[PDB]
Amino acid sequence: MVNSFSGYLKLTDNVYIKNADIVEEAKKVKPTVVVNAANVYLKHGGGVAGALNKATNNAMQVESDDYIATNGPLKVGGSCVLSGHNLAKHCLHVVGPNVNKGEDIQLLKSAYENFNQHEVLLAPLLSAGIFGADPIHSLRVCVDTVRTNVYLAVFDKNLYDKLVSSFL
C-alpha cells in the first residue's frame, strides 16, 4: 500500500533510507511504529533515545520507568512495545548490542528480528551512533534480516552518503 514516507532512497524491495532527524520525521509522518535505540533499563539519556524522549517532554521516560518496575530489564537483542506518545502510535524499544559495553555484535541480528513483528517501521540503524557499531555493518544486517518495510533515518549527512555509496 502507498504510504506517506517521502524522499527516501529505495535500497531493496523492503528497505528505504533518508538523511533525516528521526524526531522530525516521526512528528511529520506519525507512523504506526517508531523504533527507539533503547538500552535494557529503558534509560533514555542520549543518542536516539534521549532525542525521542526529549521530544515527548519526558513522557516516554515516565512510561518506561513504570514498565521496568513491573517487568524488569529487557534483554540485549530484545524489545518491548510502548506508546509512541506524540511521535507515533507505538514505539518499539529495541536493544542492540552496545560495543562500548563489550556486548556481542552477533546480537545485532536478533535485535533486527524484532522489526519483523511490524509491517511498517520508521527506524534508526541499530547499534550505530553511541552504541559503537559500524553503521555500514548495521545496514547490511538490517537488509539481510528485516523482511517488513523499514524506513531508515540517518542523522548525519556524511554517514548517509557513505551508507548509500557503499551499499551492495
mmCIF file of all heavy atoms in Angstrom, residues 19-63:
data_model
loop_
_atom_site.group_PDB
_atom_site.id
_atom_site.type_symbol
_atom_site.label_atom_id
_atom_site.label_comp_id
_atom_site.label_asym_id
_atom_site.label_seq_id
_atom_site.Cartn_x
_atom_site.Cartn_y
_atom_site.Cartn_z
ATOM 1 N N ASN A 19 18.389 10.788 4.722
ATOM 2 C CA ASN A 19 19.115 11.625 5.677
ATOM 3 C C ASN A 19 18.074 12.472 6.387
ATOM 4 O O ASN A 19 17.485 13.369 5.785
ATOM 5 C CB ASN A 19 20.146 12.489 4.956
ATOM 6 C CG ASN A 19 20.850 13.515 5.870
ATOM 7 O OD1 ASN A 19 21.106 14.643 5.441
ATOM 8 N ND2 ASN A 19 21.185 13.135 7.098
ATOM 9 N N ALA A 20 17.810 12.164 7.649
ATOM 10 C CA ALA A 20 16.755 12.862 8.362
ATOM 11 C C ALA A 20 16.949 12.688 9.854
ATOM 12 O O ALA A 20 17.577 11.733 10.321
ATOM 13 C CB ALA A 20 15.364 12.354 7.968
ATOM 14 N N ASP A 21 16.422 13.663 10.575
ATOM 15 C CA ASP A 21 16.308 13.622 12.016
ATOM 16 C C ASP A 21 15.056 12.815 12.354
ATOM 17 O O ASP A 21 13.938 13.212 12.007
ATOM 18 C CB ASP A 21 16.207 15.078 12.474
ATOM 19 C CG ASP A 21 16.058 15.236 13.964
ATOM 20 O OD1 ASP A 21 15.781 14.260 14.662
ATOM 21 O OD2 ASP A 21 16.217 16.379 14.435
ATOM 22 N N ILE A 22 15.240 11.664 13.012
ATOM 23 C CA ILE A 22 14.116 10.755 13.253
ATOM 24 C C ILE A 22 13.005 11.415 14.069
ATOM 25 O O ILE A 22 11.822 11.067 13.914
ATOM 26 C CB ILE A 22 14.625 9.444 13.896
ATOM 27 C CG1 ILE A 22 13.530 8.376 13.923
ATOM 28 C CG2 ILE A 22 15.211 9.681 15.284
ATOM 29 C CD1 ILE A 22 14.053 7.001 14.345
ATOM 30 N N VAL A 23 13.358 12.365 14.946
ATOM 31 C CA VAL A 23 12.340 13.092 15.706
ATOM 32 C C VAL A 23 11.431 13.875 14.766
ATOM 33 O O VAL A 23 10.200 13.808 14.860
ATOM 34 C CB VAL A 23 12.999 14.020 16.746
ATOM 35 C CG1 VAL A 23 11.968 15.005 17.343
ATOM 36 C CG2 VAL A 23 13.682 13.219 17.839
ATOM 37 N N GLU A 24 12.027 14.636 13.848
ATOM 38 C CA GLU A 24 11.226 15.448 12.940
ATOM 39 C C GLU A 24 10.456 14.570 11.971
ATOM 40 O O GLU A 24 9.307 14.866 11.625
ATOM 41 C CB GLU A 24 12.135 16.413 12.186
ATOM 42 C CG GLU A 24 12.566 17.620 13.008
ATOM 43 C CD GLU A 24 11.478 18.200 13.905
ATOM 44 O OE1 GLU A 24 10.455 18.688 13.381
ATOM 45 O OE2 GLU A 24 11.657 18.172 15.142
ATOM 46 N N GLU A 25 11.083 13.480 11.503
ATOM 47 C CA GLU A 25 10.387 12.530 10.636
ATOM 48 C C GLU A 25 9.150 11.983 11.336
ATOM 49 O O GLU A 25 8.047 11.984 10.776
ATOM 50 C CB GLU A 25 11.312 11.360 10.264
ATOM 51 C CG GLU A 25 12.227 11.507 9.035
ATOM 52 C CD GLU A 25 11.505 11.737 7.699
ATOM 53 O OE1 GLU A 25 10.897 10.791 7.139
ATOM 54 O OE2 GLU A 25 11.578 12.873 7.185
ATOM 55 N N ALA A 26 9.317 11.513 12.575
ATOM 56 C CA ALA A 26 8.187 10.936 13.291
ATOM 57 C C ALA A 26 7.080 11.966 13.489
ATOM 58 O O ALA A 26 5.895 11.673 13.296
ATOM 59 C CB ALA A 26 8.672 10.394 14.637
ATOM 60 N N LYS A 27 7.445 13.182 13.887
ATOM 61 C CA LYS A 27 6.433 14.214 14.088
ATOM 62 C C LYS A 27 5.617 14.453 12.823
ATOM 63 O O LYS A 27 4.400 14.664 12.891
ATOM 64 C CB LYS A 27 7.104 15.494 14.566
ATOM 65 C CG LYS A 27 7.483 15.439 16.033
ATOM 66 C CD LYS A 27 7.560 16.837 16.618
ATOM 67 C CE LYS A 27 8.964 17.181 17.087
ATOM 68 N NZ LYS A 27 9.258 18.642 17.069
ATOM 69 N N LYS A 28 6.269 14.416 11.659
ATOM 70 C CA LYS A 28 5.598 14.716 10.395
ATOM 71 C C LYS A 28 4.722 13.552 9.927
ATOM 72 O O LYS A 28 3.560 13.750 9.550
ATOM 73 C CB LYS A 28 6.669 15.105 9.356
ATOM 74 C CG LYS A 28 6.242 15.235 7.863
ATOM 75 C CD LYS A 28 6.450 13.904 7.096
ATOM 76 C CE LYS A 28 6.302 13.980 5.561
ATOM 77 N NZ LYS A 28 5.536 12.801 5.009
ATOM 78 N N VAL A 29 5.256 12.333 9.971
ATOM 79 C CA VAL A 29 4.586 11.159 9.418
ATOM 80 C C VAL A 29 3.582 10.552 10.395
ATOM 81 O O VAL A 29 2.552 10.007 9.972
ATOM 82 C CB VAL A 29 5.663 10.142 9.002
ATOM 83 C CG1 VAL A 29 5.028 8.826 8.582
ATOM 84 C CG2 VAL A 29 6.552 10.735 7.900
ATOM 85 N N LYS A 30 3.866 10.621 11.693
ATOM 86 C CA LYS A 30 3.090 9.935 12.719
ATOM 87 C C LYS A 30 2.936 8.457 12.347
ATOM 88 O O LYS A 30 1.817 7.948 12.218
ATOM 89 C CB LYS A 30 1.742 10.602 12.963
ATOM 90 C CG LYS A 30 1.172 10.309 14.329
ATOM 91 C CD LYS A 30 0.029 11.223 14.712
ATOM 92 C CE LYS A 30 0.417 12.645 15.028
ATOM 93 N NZ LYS A 30 1.243 12.695 16.263
ATOM 94 N N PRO A 31 4.050 7.751 12.154
ATOM 95 C CA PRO A 31 3.983 6.364 11.714
ATOM 96 C C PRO A 31 3.304 5.492 12.750
ATOM 97 O O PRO A 31 3.235 5.816 13.935
ATOM 98 C CB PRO A 31 5.460 5.988 11.539
ATOM 99 C CG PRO A 31 6.172 6.853 12.585
ATOM 100 C CD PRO A 31 5.430 8.164 12.515
ATOM 101 N N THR A 32 2.838 4.338 12.296
ATOM 102 C CA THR A 32 2.316 3.359 13.231
ATOM 103 C C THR A 32 3.373 2.962 14.250
ATOM 104 O O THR A 32 3.061 2.802 15.435
ATOM 105 C CB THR A 32 1.790 2.160 12.446
ATOM 106 O OG1 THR A 32 0.803 2.636 11.529
ATOM 107 C CG2 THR A 32 1.178 1.121 13.359
ATOM 108 N N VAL A 33 4.626 2.801 13.809
ATOM 109 C CA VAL A 33 5.717 2.386 14.685
ATOM 110 C C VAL A 33 6.957 3.231 14.429
ATOM 111 O O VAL A 33 7.459 3.297 13.298
ATOM 112 C CB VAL A 33 6.089 0.901 14.487
ATOM 113 C CG1 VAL A 33 7.216 0.496 15.427
ATOM 114 C CG2 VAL A 33 4.880 -0.004 14.687
ATOM 115 N N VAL A 34 7.488 3.835 15.503
ATOM 116 C CA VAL A 34 8.841 4.362 15.508
ATOM 117 C C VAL A 34 9.695 3.462 16.394
ATOM 118 O O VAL A 34 9.276 3.084 17.493
ATOM 119 C CB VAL A 34 8.918 5.851 15.927
ATOM 120 C CG1 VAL A 34 8.522 6.078 17.382
ATOM 121 C CG2 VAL A 34 10.307 6.415 15.657
ATOM 122 N N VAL A 35 10.897 3.138 15.924
ATOM 123 C CA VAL A 35 11.841 2.342 16.698
ATOM 124 C C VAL A 35 12.751 3.260 17.507
ATOM 125 O O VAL A 35 13.324 4.226 16.979
ATOM 126 C CB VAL A 35 12.673 1.439 15.775
ATOM 127 C CG1 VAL A 35 13.764 0.718 16.548
ATOM 128 C CG2 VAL A 35 11.775 0.460 15.046
ATOM 129 N N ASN A 36 12.895 2.932 18.797
ATOM 130 C CA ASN A 36 13.888 3.549 19.651
ATOM 131 C C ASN A 36 15.105 2.644 19.788
ATOM 132 O O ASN A 36 14.983 1.417 19.921
ATOM 133 C CB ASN A 36 13.305 3.827 21.033
ATOM 134 C CG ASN A 36 14.290 4.525 21.943
ATOM 135 O OD1 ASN A 36 15.116 5.310 21.485
ATOM 136 N ND2 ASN A 36 14.178 4.245 23.237
ATOM 137 N N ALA A 37 16.284 3.278 19.779
ATOM 138 C CA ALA A 37 17.552 2.626 20.100
ATOM 139 C C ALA A 37 17.699 2.584 21.622
ATOM 140 O O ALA A 37 18.367 3.420 22.241
ATOM 141 C CB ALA A 37 18.709 3.394 19.468
ATOM 142 N N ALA A 38 17.036 1.610 22.229
ATOM 143 C CA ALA A 38 16.924 1.502 23.675
ATOM 144 C C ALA A 38 18.110 0.760 24.291
ATOM 145 O O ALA A 38 18.860 0.044 23.622
ATOM 146 C CB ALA A 38 15.632 0.771 24.021
ATOM 147 N N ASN A 39 18.231 0.907 25.609
ATOM 148 C CA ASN A 39 19.061 0.037 26.425
ATOM 149 C C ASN A 39 18.165 -0.803 27.337
ATOM 150 O O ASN A 39 16.949 -0.603 27.411
ATOM 151 C CB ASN A 39 20.134 0.833 27.193
ATOM 152 C CG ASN A 39 19.553 1.901 28.086
ATOM 153 O OD1 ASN A 39 18.635 1.636 28.883
ATOM 154 N ND2 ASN A 39 20.097 3.117 27.983
ATOM 155 N N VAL A 40 18.778 -1.781 28.013
ATOM 156 C CA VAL A 40 17.976 -2.755 28.750
ATOM 157 C C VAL A 40 17.182 -2.141 29.889
ATOM 158 O O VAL A 40 16.183 -2.723 30.328
ATOM 159 C CB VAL A 40 18.794 -3.951 29.275
ATOM 160 C CG1 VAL A 40 19.359 -4.771 28.113
ATOM 161 C CG2 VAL A 40 19.879 -3.522 30.249
ATOM 162 N N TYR A 41 17.630 -0.997 30.409
ATOM 163 C CA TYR A 41 16.966 -0.315 31.518
ATOM 164 C C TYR A 41 15.963 0.726 31.046
ATOM 165 O O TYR A 41 15.344 1.400 31.875
ATOM 166 C CB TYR A 41 18.021 0.366 32.413
ATOM 167 C CG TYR A 41 19.077 -0.581 32.902
ATOM 168 C CD1 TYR A 41 20.379 -0.483 32.453
ATOM 169 C CD2 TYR A 41 18.764 -1.584 33.789
ATOM 170 C CE1 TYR A 41 21.338 -1.366 32.882
ATOM 171 C CE2 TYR A 41 19.722 -2.486 34.223
ATOM 172 C CZ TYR A 41 21.011 -2.365 33.761
ATOM 173 O OH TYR A 41 21.995 -3.234 34.180
ATOM 174 N N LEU A 42 15.823 0.900 29.729
ATOM 175 C CA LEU A 42 14.995 1.954 29.165
ATOM 176 C C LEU A 42 15.315 3.316 29.792
ATOM 177 O O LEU A 42 14.407 4.102 30.066
ATOM 178 C CB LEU A 42 13.506 1.638 29.242
ATOM 179 C CG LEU A 42 13.047 0.358 28.546
ATOM 180 C CD1 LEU A 42 11.553 0.197 28.743
ATOM 181 C CD2 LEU A 42 13.396 0.343 27.075
ATOM 182 N N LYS A 43 16.616 3.592 29.965
ATOM 183 C CA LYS A 43 17.097 4.889 30.445
ATOM 184 C C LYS A 43 17.461 5.697 29.205
ATOM 185 O O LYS A 43 18.488 5.451 28.565
ATOM 186 C CB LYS A 43 18.275 4.729 31.388
ATOM 187 C CG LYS A 43 17.872 4.214 32.750
ATOM 188 C CD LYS A 43 19.017 4.144 33.717
ATOM 189 C CE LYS A 43 18.523 4.033 35.131
ATOM 190 N NZ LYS A 43 19.626 4.050 36.087
ATOM 191 N N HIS A 44 16.592 6.634 28.841
ATOM 192 C CA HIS A 44 16.677 7.306 27.542
ATOM 193 C C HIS A 44 17.505 8.589 27.680
ATOM 194 O O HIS A 44 16.992 9.698 27.632
ATOM 195 C CB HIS A 44 15.283 7.597 27.021
ATOM 196 C CG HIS A 44 14.396 6.398 26.987
ATOM 197 N ND1 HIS A 44 14.717 5.230 26.319
ATOM 198 C CD2 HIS A 44 13.193 6.213 27.581
ATOM 199 C CE1 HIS A 44 13.723 4.378 26.526
ATOM 200 N NE2 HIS A 44 12.780 4.946 27.270
ATOM 201 N N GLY A 45 18.811 8.413 27.858
ATOM 202 C CA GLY A 45 19.659 9.541 28.240
ATOM 203 C C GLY A 45 20.232 10.336 27.088
ATOM 204 O O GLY A 45 20.426 11.550 27.194
ATOM 205 N N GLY A 46 20.559 9.650 26.003
ATOM 206 C CA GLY A 46 21.268 10.252 24.897
ATOM 207 C C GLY A 46 21.063 9.454 23.630
ATOM 208 O O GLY A 46 20.315 8.468 23.597
ATOM 209 N N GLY A 47 21.736 9.885 22.570
ATOM 210 C CA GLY A 47 21.547 9.261 21.279
ATOM 211 C C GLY A 47 20.105 9.395 20.811
ATOM 212 O O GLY A 47 19.397 10.361 21.149
ATOM 213 N N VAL A 48 19.654 8.413 20.019
ATOM 214 C CA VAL A 48 18.270 8.402 19.552
ATOM 215 C C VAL A 48 17.309 8.440 20.739
ATOM 216 O O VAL A 48 16.287 9.142 20.705
ATOM 217 C CB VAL A 48 18.017 7.157 18.685
ATOM 218 C CG1 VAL A 48 16.532 6.978 18.393
ATOM 219 C CG2 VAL A 48 18.843 7.205 17.418
ATOM 220 N N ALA A 49 17.578 7.631 21.768
ATOM 221 C CA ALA A 49 16.636 7.523 22.876
ATOM 222 C C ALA A 49 16.479 8.856 23.596
ATOM 223 O O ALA A 49 15.360 9.279 23.908
ATOM 224 C CB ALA A 49 17.098 6.449 23.848
ATOM 225 N N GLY A 50 17.596 9.522 23.890
ATOM 226 C CA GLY A 50 17.498 10.814 24.547
ATOM 227 C C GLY A 50 16.733 11.815 23.709
ATOM 228 O O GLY A 50 15.963 12.629 24.242
ATOM 229 N N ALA A 51 16.943 11.788 22.388
ATOM 230 C CA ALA A 51 16.247 12.715 21.498
ATOM 231 C C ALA A 51 14.751 12.415 21.416
ATOM 232 O O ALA A 51 13.913 13.323 21.520
ATOM 233 C CB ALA A 51 16.888 12.657 20.110
ATOM 234 N N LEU A 52 14.379 11.143 21.228
ATOM 235 C CA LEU A 52 12.954 10.802 21.194
ATOM 236 C C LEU A 52 12.295 11.164 22.518
ATOM 237 O O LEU A 52 11.214 11.763 22.551
ATOM 238 C CB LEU A 52 12.753 9.314 20.893
ATOM 239 C CG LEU A 52 13.133 8.823 19.494
ATOM 240 C CD1 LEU A 52 12.986 7.316 19.423
ATOM 241 C CD2 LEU A 52 12.296 9.477 18.413
ATOM 242 N N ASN A 53 12.938 10.804 23.636
ATOM 243 C CA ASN A 53 12.319 11.079 24.925
ATOM 244 C C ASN A 53 12.132 12.581 25.141
ATOM 245 O O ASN A 53 11.078 13.024 25.624
ATOM 246 C CB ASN A 53 13.148 10.465 26.047
ATOM 247 C CG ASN A 53 12.570 10.821 27.395
ATOM 248 O OD1 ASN A 53 11.400 10.531 27.672
ATOM 249 N ND2 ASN A 53 13.362 11.501 28.216
ATOM 250 N N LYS A 54 13.148 13.384 24.806
ATOM 251 C CA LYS A 54 13.030 14.829 24.942
ATOM 252 C C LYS A 54 11.836 15.345 24.142
ATOM 253 O O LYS A 54 11.091 16.221 24.603
ATOM 254 C CB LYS A 54 14.350 15.478 24.507
ATOM 255 C CG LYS A 54 14.390 16.988 24.593
ATOM 256 C CD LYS A 54 15.760 17.547 24.121
ATOM 257 C CE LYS A 54 15.804 19.049 24.138
ATOM 258 N NZ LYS A 54 17.101 19.549 23.591
ATOM 259 N N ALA A 55 11.633 14.818 22.934
ATOM 260 C CA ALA A 55 10.526 15.256 22.097
ATOM 261 C C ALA A 55 9.172 14.931 22.709
ATOM 262 O O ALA A 55 8.183 15.619 22.430
ATOM 263 C CB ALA A 55 10.660 14.637 20.704
ATOM 264 N N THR A 56 9.098 13.907 23.556
ATOM 265 C CA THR A 56 7.879 13.554 24.286
ATOM 266 C C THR A 56 7.743 14.300 25.613
ATOM 267 O O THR A 56 6.837 13.988 26.397
ATOM 268 C CB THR A 56 7.781 12.038 24.566
ATOM 269 O OG1 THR A 56 8.648 11.649 25.657
ATOM 270 C CG2 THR A 56 8.031 11.195 23.333
ATOM 271 N N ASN A 57 8.611 15.273 25.895
ATOM 272 C CA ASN A 57 8.506 16.021 27.145
ATOM 273 C C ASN A 57 8.702 15.089 28.346
ATOM 274 O O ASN A 57 8.142 15.320 29.423
ATOM 275 C CB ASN A 57 7.161 16.792 27.190
ATOM 276 C CG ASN A 57 6.983 17.674 28.412
ATOM 277 O OD1 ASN A 57 7.922 18.323 28.865
ATOM 278 N ND2 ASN A 57 5.755 17.709 28.947
ATOM 279 N N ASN A 58 9.506 14.032 28.180
ATOM 280 C CA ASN A 58 9.836 13.056 29.218
ATOM 281 C C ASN A 58 8.714 12.049 29.477
ATOM 282 O O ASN A 58 8.871 11.194 30.353
ATOM 283 C CB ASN A 58 10.295 13.689 30.542
ATOM 284 C CG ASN A 58 11.303 12.821 31.292
ATOM 285 O OD1 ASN A 58 12.317 12.389 30.732
ATOM 286 N ND2 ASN A 58 11.059 12.588 32.567
ATOM 287 N N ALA A 59 7.619 12.092 28.722
ATOM 288 C CA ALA A 59 6.559 11.109 28.926
ATOM 289 C C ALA A 59 7.043 9.699 28.604
ATOM 290 O O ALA A 59 6.632 8.727 29.252
ATOM 291 C CB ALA A 59 5.319 11.464 28.115
ATOM 292 N N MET A 60 7.905 9.555 27.593
ATOM 293 C CA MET A 60 8.474 8.246 27.289
ATOM 294 C C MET A 60 9.227 7.680 28.497
ATOM 295 O O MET A 60 9.086 6.491 28.827
ATOM 296 C CB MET A 60 9.371 8.362 26.047
ATOM 297 C CG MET A 60 10.074 7.063 25.696
ATOM 298 S SD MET A 60 11.131 7.237 24.239
ATOM 299 C CE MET A 60 9.895 7.297 22.943
ATOM 300 N N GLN A 61 10.030 8.516 29.170
ATOM 301 C CA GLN A 61 10.783 8.040 30.321
ATOM 302 C C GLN A 61 9.858 7.645 31.471
ATOM 303 O O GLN A 61 10.086 6.623 32.129
ATOM 304 C CB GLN A 61 11.786 9.106 30.786
ATOM 305 C CG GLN A 61 12.755 8.574 31.836
ATOM 306 C CD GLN A 61 13.630 7.490 31.224
ATOM 307 O OE1 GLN A 61 14.430 7.777 30.320
ATOM 308 N NE2 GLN A 61 13.441 6.246 31.637
ATOM 309 N N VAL A 62 8.824 8.444 31.741
ATOM 310 C CA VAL A 62 7.882 8.121 32.818
ATOM 311 C C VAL A 62 7.238 6.759 32.563
ATOM 312 O O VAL A 62 7.168 5.893 33.457
ATOM 313 C CB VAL A 62 6.849 9.257 32.957
ATOM 314 C CG1 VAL A 62 5.707 8.870 33.891
ATOM 315 C CG2 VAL A 62 7.546 10.515 33.444
ATOM 316 N N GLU A 63 6.752 6.556 31.340
ATOM 317 C CA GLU A 63 6.146 5.278 30.978
ATOM 318 C C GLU A 63 7.146 4.132 31.110
ATOM 319 O O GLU A 63 6.816 3.025 31.573
ATOM 320 C CB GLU A 63 5.634 5.383 29.546
ATOM 321 C CG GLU A 63 5.028 4.107 29.006
ATOM 322 C CD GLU A 63 4.849 4.150 27.503
ATOM 323 O OE1 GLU A 63 5.682 4.792 26.816
ATOM 324 O OE2 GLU A 63 3.877 3.505 27.011
#
